[PDB]
Design a protein around this ligand. Sequence first.
Ligand SMILES: [Ca+2]
Ligand SMILES: [Ca+2]
Ligand SMILES: [Ca+2]
Lengths: 533, 533, 533
Amino acid sequence: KIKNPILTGFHPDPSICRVGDDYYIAVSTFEWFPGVRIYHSKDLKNWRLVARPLNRLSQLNMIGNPDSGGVWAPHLSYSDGKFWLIYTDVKVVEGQWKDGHNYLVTCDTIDGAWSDPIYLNSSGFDPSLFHDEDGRKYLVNMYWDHRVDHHPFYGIVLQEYSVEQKKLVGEPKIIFKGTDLRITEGPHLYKINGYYYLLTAEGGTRYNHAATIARSTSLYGPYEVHPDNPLLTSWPYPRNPLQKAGHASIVHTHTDEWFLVHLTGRPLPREGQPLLEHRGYCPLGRETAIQRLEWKDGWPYVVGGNGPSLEIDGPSVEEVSWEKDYDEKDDFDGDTLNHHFQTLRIPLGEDIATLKARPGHLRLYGRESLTSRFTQAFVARRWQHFHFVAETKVSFRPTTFQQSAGLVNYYNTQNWTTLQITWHEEKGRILELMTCDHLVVDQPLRGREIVVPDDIEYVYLRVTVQATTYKYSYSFDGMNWIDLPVTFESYKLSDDYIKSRAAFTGAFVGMHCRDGSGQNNYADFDYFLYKEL
Amino acid sequence: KIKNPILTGFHPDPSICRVGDDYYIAVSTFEWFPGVRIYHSKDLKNWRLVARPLNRLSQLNMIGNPDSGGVWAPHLSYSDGKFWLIYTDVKVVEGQWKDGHNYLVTCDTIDGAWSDPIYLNSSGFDPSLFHDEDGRKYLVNMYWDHRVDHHPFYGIVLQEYSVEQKKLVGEPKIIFKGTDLRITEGPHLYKINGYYYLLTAEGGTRYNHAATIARSTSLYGPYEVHPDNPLLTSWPYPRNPLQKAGHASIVHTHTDEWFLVHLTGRPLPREGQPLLEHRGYCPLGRETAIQRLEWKDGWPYVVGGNGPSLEIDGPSVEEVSWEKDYDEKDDFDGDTLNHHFQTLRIPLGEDIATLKARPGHLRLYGRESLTSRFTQAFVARRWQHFHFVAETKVSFRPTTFQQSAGLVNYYNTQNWTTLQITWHEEKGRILELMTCDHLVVDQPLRGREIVVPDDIEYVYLRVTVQATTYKYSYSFDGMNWIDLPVTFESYKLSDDYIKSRAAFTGAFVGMHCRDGSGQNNYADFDYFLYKEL
Amino acid sequence: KIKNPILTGFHPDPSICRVGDDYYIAVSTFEWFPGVRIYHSKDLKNWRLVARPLNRLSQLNMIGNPDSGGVWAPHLSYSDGKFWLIYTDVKVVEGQWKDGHNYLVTCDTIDGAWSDPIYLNSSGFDPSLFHDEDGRKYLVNMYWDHRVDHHPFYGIVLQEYSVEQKKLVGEPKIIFKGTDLRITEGPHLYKINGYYYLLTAEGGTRYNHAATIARSTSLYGPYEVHPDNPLLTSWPYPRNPLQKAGHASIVHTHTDEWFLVHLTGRPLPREGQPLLEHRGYCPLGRETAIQRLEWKDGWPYVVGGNGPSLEIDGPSVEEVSWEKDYDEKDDFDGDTLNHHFQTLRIPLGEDIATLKARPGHLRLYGRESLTSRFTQAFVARRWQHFHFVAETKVSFRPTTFQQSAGLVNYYNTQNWTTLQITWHEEKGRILELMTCDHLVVDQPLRGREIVVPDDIEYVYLRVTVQATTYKYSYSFDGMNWIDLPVTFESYKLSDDYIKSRAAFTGAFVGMHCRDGSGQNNYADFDYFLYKEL
Ligand SMILES: [Ca+2]
Ligand SMILES: [Ca+2]
Ligand SMILES: [Ca+2]
């Protein structure tokens, strides 16, 4: 029935929420705006994107945020007639500190206008809101220890949240220190039988990742750990196509069944490589998967052992699937950008991105370079398959080398590749390739750039991705295409390749326009095509 | 009569401006808020701070800005009965790009409410406005080349500025490529006798720094280079106490005399070290000096060779000295912080820094770590001398290791040291040392931390800087001091030590409070003492 | 019956050989001279050093050899009335190449004058001689692939050796490529039942290490791999005190029993650290352990699962215990240095190290520094316990800072610490600490070196190692001891700390004398003491 991953491409930290017979999963979005994606399902198999809650500067202001800062793991719940969304804005992501703030927003409906944030605390990321049976509310999060002689993951902190006073009350207490896997994060609380069950993520979000579960009769512990912990992990299964299994959340369905959603990374093919030396590269980032849970002696168990199954049995409900929510060829005739498109850190107003200036075209007025954490005229969508084609049609007339416009394959500000139109003193308006690898830039078509003829209005730009490798191509007419003689490697756009280890997103493909002279020069994009192959 | 530097500690890129018998210098301030410091003098010997023009978010919004980003070289001038201040907000300071924006503000007076900014261009930093003798205005700046096969300093660009239209009009034109020293920046135009003189900075702002001058009978050139260029440089003078002489501006006094203000670095004592191997470390950063000029065959000449002299002859005027504009022991009596104190990137409101919460105390409500480019509860002043003592007295009750308050000696987010009060599980409230060196943190007193007794209201914190080294000491009663047994090295808080190259500020000393838990805990500082020894 | 490890401290790549009811283990020695250690046992429990075969420069000339070059995994066998020892001299240990040459030497007895070397090949390390039941002999080793886009471990090459002709004959052929673990290494052939069994090490000699075994009816394959492979590994057993389990050799006992000897690393205590993030630091290097085998369906199985056991049941023989073969306090009254002492790379003659010059003393005439891969006057023995004291008493009169003598804890030329006597211009004869970490040197007692009174003939030097940390101490009278106020960390002298990953030895402690002036000054060491606990 259900084949994993259920949300493919960049969809980390799944937070599942049941309301009656409707099912919702919220995922993390990091530096990508608007914040948080929420998907809806009736059967836990078929998923549609239904909300992007954090879309006002008042809720989320990420200008200047570092790569893989911003919205880390979110928590979605439903109680007292409304949804509650907890999120972080992480400002520091390297060194001894992880400075970040936790906020609560609510909405009567999933896709409404969510409230302005209530500040909660800053003591660590992965905040989660528990609604106890007695009506009381409790916030759990990881607690950050910056000290040099210490492991940073101090455990799980708990504090009561007062709905009336709109603040945390009483005194924060550590309720769980973790197991020897450490890196204890992603806390979630569940009241089942006579017990409070505390789910955590452990071992870090790379190949040692795990989901850990413990139980207590007291909300404050001590929590005893699952006798066969971890509840879930891919670490001891190096051949499993689903790696990095952890950061899970539990759903008890209306049909009295139990399921476990979690993130996973799918490494590129590694034939002829040592199995254990380096466990792979994941250009699709961390995706969402689902597993079935069964119960023994007051403990939940992943059906099929503690490793993640590629295929599972769905809940005992009717199949409810959804119509495709985007066009393979987006011709930009709508009065809104398709919701699969995102921008970096900030919303782009009509002065930067516009569908209005020229009907049938997305106009991007050139801003800063692809290395800027501030203002980029860049509109992009996730890689969601290993094998796909992406294509755009653009008219652009740069008057200086400081201006560019192109198709970008992009991981972060220091890691990206592009086929772009720019200007050259001798050759005039040209086509070139440009790559950025850990801030180091190369121009591989150096001295051999494609001259664009004065009479060509639209340049056609394409990328064809084939698992491990990809190639750029172009056309001046839309029918006859020419390969550019450079083979690119998809592993360079993966979490695992990034040397900072603050690498929590995934590859995007999109349309960019830069104007470094500040003359407000723009490019018109007639369509954007994304098609799985 | 005039001893250099005239402005000590962090005071780079002096832009001099004459209005009658009044003289003003504007210097760059980078990430430090508010933007730009303007000093006033009558005699060019004695200088007083009179303006801090960029004090509104509408003018300068640097949250998230990289270290040594923000406000680079400013340009101050006076024309048509008003002051004209040109400045940059530089967003990217490493790699192939230098994303940054150029703005103009004006004020009828030096110390009034400067206008909201008019956006100029983005083509490169070091913008300068020229007021031609016919009433037309011209902007010159550097033109940035990001290409791999190319030197970044494409030369000097010029475009007319329309006062009435509030924008640049016509087409931008490169008027000068520079000499073979390259790194052509800091352009300033002057109409003298019958020539347009173009003064540039070349060689880079390190030890190869130079001031290059050229002239043309046409504004658009071609420009002919001074026959004995550089006009000013320190490079051939390795024994000169004033290094890095460059980025100059020219004043013609009301006494028909000519001077040249310039930045300079003052390396720490390096007796016994090889003269040319490494030319020094400057913790006072780039400071402002002044040279005398003389004219020979339509060319200005720095008096006493093209190297900077330590002492010059002042202009033919009466000496006017100023009263001391800060207290040695600032007891925080005013309803405003002394103008030598600045904040990082952003203004701090009364929710973060206040003199109103506890009379005669600066209260700092704890925010993010010393590594944050976002919101730090940090109030600091420049090291302005090689030998000094700085001291504070603070009330602070931390309830967690997530909270701290202390005395900080600070270069940037990744380079600093501190004597701070925090909390320890076993020891309770404690004093400790902490250093950060290129993001790597050490805690020199780990396991040896100073236990602060419960009955102690105030902890006194002291730093004593003796040129190449400094030491922290503490006291519980204000009378009996104990040195902490660790000797620090001042060269680690210097421009020349920072491996990024983007190191354009200088050492500061100040008061910090962090609350990483988000509980709004605060520290009350009774006084701040800074005294030259 | 038997507690692991059986050979403690630096004892990697065990090659076991049975001759009747005598058992022999040879281990690798890398840059330490003489080459190869052979231990003897009757019961597999108690082991005594009996031979150091490679003691002539004709056999082993290692001057200039890089750290962790020289003698890699050896192979010891017995057939046709003599012992056969195969060894490598590895010259290149970093980069695409691993240049090294394989040699055979023979001796009628374990401890006699071994023959001069018969050169064999250079196709890759871990050579092993097989003696087929039909009186023919074949060499197996790993095949080295230097190519830029190739895994260097091409597999196992096999080739016949001819006794009469003193060389290899016929055609070389690959018999095994390995499993997905790769890094295929340490091949050994055994004829058991109707199958040839080929044993290899896979996964690399760090935490992914395994022993792999396969079988075939033909000497040339194809080899089918053990269905429950690996035969032995510590990888899926992160809590096991014995890690890196692999590079095994098989013994069949005169009692019709089967055992597997292997190398293993025992990480230092790491309480509070993430189980999987970094699996540990092993200052005792790679040690020798022993496992029991059983047979099931024509395949051998490690008794007690495929992870290594800490305690095993040895073979049904009478226990034969050995007398201690060194004095706790070696007073240097003997004619020759105790055989637990080794020198770096080369033998040291009486011109450098001698027990004859000064009765009751080991005299070292100073040579090159601790960073020299050529001639060091350095006599050292293995760290063999996590908790020990080592101590010496030395007479030394340096006349220049170019001269030193002291007690050294040493990993390689770039990684060591020492308490040493030297000379200072103003203080004169001093005692100081010095450390070297990846070539970076520190003097942590700089400016506070201990003045040695001129009337003191002997300085007493001590190190006390307590698992994760150690401290040096000194005395002038041998009764009253003062700690030097620096705590050192044992992990910095471990295989796992070394950045080059050519780190195959272990920590040593010994006596050193340097004379950088060439005045042939010397140090007289009265005793050397090593004591567990
Ligand atoms: Ca269209
Ligand atoms: Ca006061
Ligand atoms: Ca003796």
